[PDB]
Amino acid sequence: HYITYRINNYTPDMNREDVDYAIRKAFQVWSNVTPLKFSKINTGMADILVVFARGAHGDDHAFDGKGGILAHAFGPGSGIGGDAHFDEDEFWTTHSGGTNLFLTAVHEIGHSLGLGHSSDPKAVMFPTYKYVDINTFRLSADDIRGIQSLYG
């Protein structure tokens, strides 16, 4: 049972190979905590679809870039497999600012990929993005199962 994993739209910030390994971490933490796998697959949409909406009303009138909601809603099932849009009302800023580097992708995508809300204080379980040094990057209990076998 193998699953496809990819990240559409490469954020033009650093080296493709450099960021590639970084952005991969986000999907990794969510992968190792879920019954699936990530392999090299061509761009043809499968399981996860990285969707974005900025500037011009993507698809239809709506505007996601600062004019809707912080992070995407809906989880794995019905509302698309799992689309996580980044850079809309936060932008890539200092680790101690709006968007805490690609790290935010972990929690961000958590909404689309899974839906382990929990809302537990004194941890990242909360619905809000919790800062975390890339060095000490890691997920605590609960969240590990909050996505494992979601809508299956």
Curated annotation (Swiss-Prot):
A Gene Ontology biological process noted in the UniProt record is:
extracellular matrix disassembly
Name where it's found.
Secreted, Extracellular space, Extracellular matrix
Q: What induces it?
A: By exposure to bacterial lipopolysaccharides (LPS). Inhibited by dexamethasone.
Protein name listed in UniProt: Macrophage metalloelastase
Which organism encodes this protein? Homo sapiens
Please tell me where Ca(2+) 1 binds in this chain: D13, E88, E90
What keywords does the record list, in alphabetical order? Calcium, Disulfide bond, Extracellular matrix, Glycoprotein, Hydrolase, Metal-binding, Metalloprotease, Protease, Repeat, Secreted, Signal, Zinc, Zymogen
| Active site per UniProt | E108
| Residues engaged in binding Zn(2+) 1 | H57, D59, H72, H85
Residues reported in the UniProt entry to bind Ca(2+) 2: D47, G79, G81, D83
